[PDB]
Write a protein that binds this ligand. Structure first.
Ligand SMILES: Nc1ncnc2c1ncn2[C@@H]1O[C@H](COP(=O)(O)OP(=O)(O)O)[C@@H](O)[C@H]1O
Ligand SMILES: Nc1ncnc2c1ncn2[C@@H]1O[C@H](COP(=O)(O)OP(=O)(O)O)[C@@H](O)[C@H]1O
Ligand code: BEF
Ligand code: BEF
Ligand SMILES: [Mg+2]
Ligand SMILES: [Mg+2]
Lengths: 51, 311, 312, 42, 42, 42
């Protein structure tokens, strides 16, 4: 129960990070910065598979 | 009857504030959501009563209070430490009682207090009678026996939150740290503070600016933009020589010997009919070389202490 | 004919709404209910308590317990801060105290509450011992009057700083009670009270998981994590794009992009009432737990263990 | 197009975020993808 | 001691009760035991 | 039952407490037992 409870906390943390990276990607396209975007929108996706 | 009331009408939009989406969220749900949706707040679900803002100087705290004051559509009171501390013995405290009293009379309402550190600090016996009487009335009158804690809202600001006493820290039940702005927020403040002035740069050039300006405050941005707006006056009145360009006559500073370069001083030139060269990137970088960041980093370590604990 | 401003209306909070407090609950039931319901027991040698102090760290439930006594009083509940006692000139600062206990005895049976007694007391030098030593002295006589008027009134004192309270007034408040931070079960109870009529999602042992997660809060900390928990579904209503009908004629709630009946809209688009908020989930609770670390500090708890360990 | 394609990625990446607010990994892994592919289509 | 041992059993048997208010049989079966053993220690 | 069995243990463990208020170890050692056995009957 203790280990599963922490796993829930940990997955919640990863989801927060994925959403953060997406927000940062969006913010980046507001300067047409495709570089940053294609990267954060990726570091994020890979991590949603790491879930 | 004392009646030391004061309130006013400023003008600051939401979106002129950069970053701070947690504070924007908490104040929209603390201001707009009670007025627009009073039916959601009923019984067990109650609005927030005490909200604290804190951080390093010039991260946008009082300007955010201006934005709440414009976007309030409510009786926005505001009081410093001046109007609370009275002469004799008794009006120092009864004015606090009348402040929250008439604040509840004009409900729904919002109360802002700037630099609440001048009213706290019960530890020790320094600042004895003013701290115990006035601070005691702030506690009990803020919530107590029969105070209607619903309705009004107490906005606290400070620069020193660790000297704030833990009891008033509990009174301000939802506290928010306001950091230095990051890259994108300072890009936004650059693109706001250029305003209607015809600039020369693009958005990623403002990104180059914010990358160059790592770790400023909002006032630092305001003065490098100010200096950037004060370079063309220096060039339009500098040395000798202006020139016509283009609604009837219009002259700007130009180098000695140029296409239509007359020799004169700004003094020689007629009201209005003088225009300065549009802000340029060099003026920005010159303003970056003009001024350090204001804040110190060990104070940032204490802000990370109180923020890391109570934020 | 220089009367004051008092309490008349009682703020309705129930007696069961508080948690812990069993010594204070015992002392106030035997100090309030037992004299009125059983006046024949208190006679001669057996006398009711005259001075009761509450104290402790901020937000352990002191003034809220005073609210509970105020609702459950069925008596003329006076209440006075340090404001109404300290007057302008020289004389009304003290005669108002005399009229306070006087008219308090006129409306007997009755209860008197004084919050933040350290603002009443507190001497350091000549300025602190002027126009507060007089009012303190009148309190000293008017609560020496246990041999004068034993029955009738009761003085309830509250504070957050009991060590700066003077020893004479400490003797005046003859039965003092420390109010600690609450434990697991009391915070489980305050969770189950402060959820109220809102349709929750959890069970009792899930509230036990909450109180286990929240080791060492105050009552205000509980009030604001429950408050934030009551703000999270409206944050879901404000958030994203997309609602959905469920189920008395049309009712829509926020749902993820692309779902069973997921229309794309904003809360603004949706009709009065016919909104459905998300039921409080443990995730909103745990997010609210991560939102606010405890308020009170543990060295202040060491001073409460100092004054409690001595005088409690 | 383009000025819009760049605008639709954000539209996607938002929905994706909004989706993770219900832990819906399915939708997410998809929109966060339809978006990325499109940033390469740029 | 004793005057206290008799007081700590009650302290236990209370916690035990308080525990069953969350159906926590574990804690209960334990405190209601640490208590009993101690009433025999009397 | 059960929802009640869990309620009767408390009923017991209370009586037991109430009993120690007269130092009555006999009653106590018994109710605190009839209770425990029953928490195992759960
Ligand atoms: N985030 C911001 N967005 C816009 N202007 C800002 C921001 N932060 C600071 N400023 C500007 O910098 C100045 C300092 O902000 P202000 O709130 O007055 O600081 P303080 O709270 O310390 O008084 C103000 O004139 C304000 O216009
Ligand atoms: N035992 C309790 N049960 C329910 N709510 C409580 C309890 N203790 C404190 N609270 C809540 O916490 C807040 C603080 O209670 P109160 O006695 O007024 O403390 P304080 O005067 O020190 O701020 C109030 O909003 C009250 O509703
Ligand atoms: F002027 Be700020 F409030 F630091
Ligand atoms: F009554 Be509390 F400690 F403010
Ligand atoms: Mg300020
Ligand atoms: Mg209090």
């Amino acid at each position: 129960t203790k280990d599963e409870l922490t796993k829930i906390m940990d997955r919640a943390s990863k989801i927060e990070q994925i959403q953060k990276l997406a927000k940062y990607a969006i913010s980046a396209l507001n300067y047409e910065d495709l570089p940053t975007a294609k990267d954060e929108l990726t570091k994020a996706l890979d991590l949603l598979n790491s879930i | 009857l004392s009646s030391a009331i004061l309130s006013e009408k400023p003008n600051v939009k939401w979106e002129d504030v950069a970053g701070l989406e947690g504070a924007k969220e908490a104040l929209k749900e603390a201001v707009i959501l009670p007025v627009k949706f009073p039916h959601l707040f009923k019984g067990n679900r109650k609005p927030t009563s005490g909200i604290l803002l804190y951080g390093p100087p010039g991260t946008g705290k009082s300007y955010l209070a201006k934005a709440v004051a414009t976007e309030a559509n409510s009786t926005f009171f505001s009081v410093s430490s001046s109007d609370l501390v009275s002469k004799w013995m008794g009006e120092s405290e009864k004015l606090v009682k009348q402040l929250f009293a008439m604040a509840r009379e004009n409900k729904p309402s919002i109360i802002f207090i700037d630099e609440v550190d001048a009213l706290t600090g019960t530890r020790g016996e320094g600042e004895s009678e003013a701290s115990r009487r006035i601070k005691t009335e702030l506690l009990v009158q803020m919530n107590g026996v029969g105070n209607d804690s619903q309705g009004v809202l107490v906005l606290g600001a400070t620069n020193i939150p660790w000297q704030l006493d833990s009891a008033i820290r509990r009174r301000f039940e939802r506290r928010i740290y306001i950091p230095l702005p990051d890259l994108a927020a300072r890009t936004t403040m650059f693109e706001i503070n250029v305003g209607d002035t015809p600039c020369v740069l693009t958005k990623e050039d403002y990104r180059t600016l914010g990358a160059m300006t790592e770790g400023y405050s909002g006032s630092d941005i305001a003065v490098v933009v100010k200096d950037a707006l004060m370079q063309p006056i220096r060039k339009i009145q500098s040395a000798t020589h202006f020139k016509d360009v283009s609604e009837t006559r219009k002259l700007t500073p130009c180098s000695p010997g140029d296409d239509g370069a007359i020799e004169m001083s700004w003094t020689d030139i007629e009201a209005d009919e003088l225009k300065e060269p549009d802000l340029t990137i060099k003026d920005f970088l010159k303003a970056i070389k003009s001024t350090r960041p204001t804040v110190n980093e060990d104070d940032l370590l204490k802000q990370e202490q109180f923020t890391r604990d109570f934020g």
